[PDB]
Amino acid sequence: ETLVRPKPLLLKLLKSVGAQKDTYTMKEVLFYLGQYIMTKRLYDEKQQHIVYCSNDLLGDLFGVPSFSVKEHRKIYTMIYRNLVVV
Ligand SMILES: CC(C)C[C@H](N[C@@H](C(=O)NCc1ccccc1)c1c(C(=O)NO)[nH]c2cc(Cl)ccc12)C(=O)NO
Numbered sequence: 001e002t003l004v005r006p007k008p009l010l011l012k013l014l015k016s017v018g019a020q021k022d023t024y025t026m027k028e029v030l031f032y033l034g035q036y037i038m039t040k041r042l043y044d045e046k047q048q049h050i051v052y053c054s055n056d057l058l059g060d061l062f063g064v065p066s067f068s069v070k071e072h073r074k075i076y077t078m079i080y081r082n083l084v085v086v
């Protein structure tokens, strides 16, 4: 699998949910992002596919006020703008 190196702000976010490393697979990045979204309760309680991220680090990184977990290609792109491959 492709190994990626999150930029400093994304890495800070990942490590806040127990990520240990400086290089990751995209699946690991998505896993830790999910953990962040879950533990901070950023998902809509009625519509769990909706993530709210205005005035959160996640929003500043992704460049959106909210997104749907179903927007896979977009999420991949939003994550990728915070990476570099290694
Ligand atoms: C509220 C949400 C975090 C719940 C979580 N959903 C995730 C999920 O939909 N993953 C499929 C997927 C596939 C490709 C791109 C984005 C998302 C998911 C996960 C995940 O690790 N699910 O286990 N991580 C995510 C990160 C982002 Cl930014 C968006 C979605 C996910 C879940 O546990 N469903 O049982």
Ligand SMILES: CC(C)C[C@H](N[C@H](C(=O)NCc1ccccc1)c1c(C(=O)NO)[nH]c2cc(Cl)ccc12)C(=O)NO
Binding pocket: 001, 026, 027, 030, 072, 073, 074, 075, 076, 077, 079
């Ligand atoms: C070899 C090839 C099939 C790649 C595929 N992995 C993709 C992947 O990196 N998934 C994690 C992920 C997916 C979407 C955003 C961020 C992170 C991936 C998957 C996938 O189904 N992984 O199991 N789905 C993707 C959707 C988009 Cl838009 C972009 C990437 C993926 C894989 O390893 N599948 O077992």
